Amino acid sequence: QFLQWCTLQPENCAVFTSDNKEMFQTESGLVVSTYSMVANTRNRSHDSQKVMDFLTGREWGFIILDEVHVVPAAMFRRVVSTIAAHAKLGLTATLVREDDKIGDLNFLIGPKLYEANWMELSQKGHIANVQCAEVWCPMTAEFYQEYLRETARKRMLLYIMNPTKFQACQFLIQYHERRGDKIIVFSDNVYALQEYALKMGKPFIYGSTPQQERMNILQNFQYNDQINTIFLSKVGDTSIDLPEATCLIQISSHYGSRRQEAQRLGRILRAKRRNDEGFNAFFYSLVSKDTQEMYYSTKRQAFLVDQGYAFKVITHLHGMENIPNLAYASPRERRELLQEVLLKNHPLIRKMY
CB-nearer residue toward another protein: 127 or 132: 132
Q: What is the dihedral of CA 128, 194, 291, 129, to 10 degrees?
A: 0
Tell the smallest beta-carbon distance from residue 98 to another protein (Å). 30
CA distance 207 to 104: 31
Binds another protein by CB under 8 A, chosen from 65, 80, 137, 183 = 137
What secondary structure letter does DSSP report for 247?
E
- Comparing CB distances to another protein, the nearer of 14 and 217 is 217
Residues 257-296 that bind another protein (CB under 8 A): 276, 278-280, 282
End-to-end distance of the chain based on CA atoms, in angstroms? 51
**x/- contact string, 54-93, with another protein (CB under 8 A)?**
----------------------------------------
Stretch that binds another protein, among 28-36, 67-75, 109-117, 223-231 (CB under 8 A): 223-231
Nearest approach, Cβ of residue 164 and another protein (Å)? 6
Rounded CA gap, 340 and 353, in Å?
44
Kindly give the residue spans of alpha helices, DSSP state H, lying in the chain. Answer: 2-5, 35-38, 46-57, 79-82, 105-108, 118-123, 141-148, 152-160, 163-178, 190-200, 211-223, 258-265, 292-307, 331-344
CA-closest candidate to residue 166, choices 148, 192, 142, 186: 192
Q: What does DSSP say about strands 287-288 and 130-137: parallel, antiparallel, or unpaired?
A: parallel
Which of 40, 48, 220, 307 is in the footprint of another protein by CB under 8 A? Answer: 220
Binding piece for another protein, criterion CB under 8 A, among 33-41, 73-81, 113-121, 214-222? 214-222
> Rounded CA gap, 338 and 170, in Å?
19
Residue whose CB is less far from another protein, 179 or 335: 179
* Segment interacting with another protein, rule: CB under 8 A, options 58-66, 183-191, 220-228, 300-308: 220-228
Q: Give me the phi and psi of 277, to 5 degrees please.
A: -75, 135
Largest CA distance in the chain: 80
In the complex, least distance from residue 77 CB atom to another protein, rounded to whole angstroms? 37
* Phi, psi dihedrals of residue 66, rounded to the nearest 5°: -70, 140
Site string for another protein, 227-246 (x = CB under 8 A): x-------------------
Binding residues for another protein, per CB under 8 A? 131, 133, 135-138, 163-164, 167-168, 175, 179-180, 197-198, 201, 203-204, 208-210, 212-213, 216-217, 219-220, 223-224, 226-227, 276, 278-280, 282, 312-318, 320-321, 326, 328-329
